[PDB]
Design a protein around this ligand. Structure first.
Ligand code: HEM
Ligand SMILES: COc1ccc(-c2nn(-c3ccccc3)cc2Cn2ccnc2)cc1
Length: 394
């Protein structure tokens, strides 16, 4: 006898398990057991993943309900699971989304300067260099301090919350509440700090004192800062890191993008499509009985939308494991989700990766792994898949 199939299948971010394609072909929605012991429906085809994400009766907010089957333990207060809904109800969605576009004058040049300085320091120190800890993550942290309007010198401490905040744990995490409360206190202080006049926090600070927002809570304002810093930094740092592995693995593509940087946006779009950064399916709780493929999902059941299921589906992306810069449907992947909860930072995440890669290829055109790929250490029980270190030479 065997036990019910357990998710996640693998913490490795450098290869997709053969099991994904087998499930997609034979059982594109099928029952699995999560790390908490709960049962869930794992959805692994493009067509069914899109159906789930585009039907709001598969609810994000209700995943936080007491007694629900859980993918993993909450690491934030349950109301924060509905963060974007709370932002919209407060009348803040347009202002938040304007503050986090990569369009602020000087932002791209800031990103370019920061990337180049980080790379110069690695060259001075000599190979091997760690492109996660000493390039991709600092670049993500610096970008998000700039976008939020907060001091660069505060970035490192805020960053150090993230290896716990973004755990994917079977049980509640005591350190997560310690760090959450401290970071909330920090952002609350930022809102009262007269030096903070730019970026997302500068704008929130002004709206907070505007009569049209006098009954929006100070807790929500601080929460926006904590959640956008954390989600943005973890997502961009982790995506860039694993994208760099996929690029290093492909010397022909590396050289092409070095020789024609105008193709970097199309290359980043394919790197997004093939990215394994999300460690778990996206969770949703059914609020009605809904037919998904051959399965009638019942009200109250947990559904997990496997992004690499959709993004490697050959019915939608032929030759799915190959980076092709000339696909006719290049942005139709689900790397940023789909529907009501589509990533509000998508443009910023694209630009972070594009500029980081452009700078790396100019400074280190011969970049290559400094260890055999099987020597990378894949973080476990985390909401992203990332190597603990990414050692390179050039
Ligand atoms: C390449 C980088 C990024 C990737 C791959 C990514 C991926 C995603 C995905 C897949 C979702 C949907 C989650 C779901 O539907 O359950 C999402 C949502 C979200 N992302 Fe991103 N993201 C990235 C960058 C960013 C940045 C830069 C920010 C903020 C500065 C950000 C903030 C958020 C937030 C707040 C949500 C929740 C949206 C909602 O619930 O409506 N992300 N992201
Ligand atoms: C729906 O927009 C969201 C945005 C962010 C989060 C989230 N922020 N942080 C976090 C960030 C910084 C410090 C500490 C915690 C962790 C999560 C993800 N998480 C945990 C439990 N359930 C979801 C959530 C929603």
């Amino acid at each position: 006898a065997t036990v019910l199939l357990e998710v996640p299948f693998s913490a490795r971010g450098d290869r997709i398990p053969d099991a994904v394609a087998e499930l997609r072909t034979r059982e594109p929605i099928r029952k699995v057991r999560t790390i908490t012991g709960a049962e869930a429906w794992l959805v692994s085809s493009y067509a069914l993943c899109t159906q789930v994400l585009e039907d709001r009766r598969f609810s994000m907010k209700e995943t936080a309900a007491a007694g629900a089957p859980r993918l993993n333990a909450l690491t934030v207060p349950p109301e924060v699971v509905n963060n974007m809904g709370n932002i919209a109800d407060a009348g803040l969605r347009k202002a938040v989304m304007k503050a986090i576009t990569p369009k602020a004058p000087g932002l791209e040049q800031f990103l370019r300067d920061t990337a180049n300085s980080l790379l110069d320091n690695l060259i001075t120190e000599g190979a091997p260099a760690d492109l996660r800890n000493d390039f991709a993550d600092p670049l993500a942290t610096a970008l998000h301090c700039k976008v939020l309007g907060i001091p660069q010198e505060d970035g490192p401490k805020l960053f150090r919350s993230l290896s716990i905040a973004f755990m994917s744990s079977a049980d509640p995490i005591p350190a997560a509440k310690i760090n959450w409360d401290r970071d909330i206190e920090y952002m609350a202080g930022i809102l009262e700090n007269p030096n903070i006049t730019t970026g997302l926090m500068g704008e929130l600070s002004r709206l907070r004192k505007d009569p049209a927002y006098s009954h929006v809570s100070d807790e929500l304002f601080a929460t926006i800062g904590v959640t956008f810093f954390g989600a943005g930094v973890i997502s961009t740092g982790s995506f860039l890191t694993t994208a760099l592995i996929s690029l290093i693995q492909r010397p022909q593509l590396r050289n092409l993008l070095h020789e024609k940087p105008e193709l970097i946006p199309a290359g980043v779009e394919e790197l997004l499509r093939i990215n394994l950064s999300f460690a778990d399916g996206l969770p949703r709780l059914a609020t009605a009985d809904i037919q998904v493929g051959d399965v009638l999902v019942r009200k109250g059941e947990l559904v997990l939308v496997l992004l690499e299921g959709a993004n490697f589906d050959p019915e939608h992306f032929p030759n799915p494991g190959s980076i092709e810069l000339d696909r006719p449907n290049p942005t139709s992947h689900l790397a940023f989700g789909r529907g009501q909860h589509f990533c509000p930072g998508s443009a910023l995440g694209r630009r972070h990766a594009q500029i980081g890669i452009e700078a790396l290829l100019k400074k280190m055109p011969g970049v290559d792994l400094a260890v055999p790929i099987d020597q990378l250490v894949w973080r476990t029980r985390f909401q992203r898949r990332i190597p603990e270190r990414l050692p390179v030479l050039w």
